Design a protein that fits this description.
Layout lengths: L5 E9 L1 H7 L4 H7 L5 E7 L2 E7 L4 E7 L4 E4 L7 E9 L2 E7 L6 E7 L2 E8 L2 E9 L1
Antiparallel strand pairs: 1-2, 1-10, 2-3, 3-4, 5-6, 6-7, 7-8, 8-9, 9-10
Helix pairs in contact: 1-2
Length: about 130
């Protein structure tokens, strides 16, 4: 399915530390970030996505239209400008963030009752698993 609608609760968060370090996020921020449960809300209407990922610490709001390039300023993470593009590869939602960092992006897909999100930066991969609430 390409339907990723819902309120999603984080089950696990593997190598978030490595991904953030690859993004040059400072030590103290990483130490807080790695321990927090995230909730991801996805409002998907055709090709229009509105997503909010939240924790006790920080919020990440990102909206996009599939197949439409958009500029991003990654204010909630490393503070960089990237050219982002989200597209479908089969049932996998694929984001490439073109800019300074190589192999920067993510892939997101539904398997059964779970949402999987794999974030990449350089040689680092963070794997997050969410279940629907």
């Amino acid at each position: 399915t390409r339907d990723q609608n819902g309120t999603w609760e984080m089950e696990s968060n593997e190598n978030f530390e490595g991904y953030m370090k690859a993004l040059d996020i400072d030590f103290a921020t990483r130490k807080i970030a790695v321990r927090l449960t995230q909730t991801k809300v996805i409002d998907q209407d055709g090709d229009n996505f509105k997503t909010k990922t939240t924790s006790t610490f920080r919020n990440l709001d990102v909206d996009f239209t599939v197949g439409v390039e958009f500029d991003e300023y990654t204010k909630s993470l490393d503070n960089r400008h990237v050219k982002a593009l989200v597209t479908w590869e089969g049932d996998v939602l694929v984001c490439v963030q073109k800019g300074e960092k190589e192999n920067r992006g993510w892939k997101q897909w539904i398997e059964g009752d779970k949402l999987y999100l794999e974030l990449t930066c350089g040689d680092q991969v963070c794997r997050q698993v969410f279940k629907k609430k």
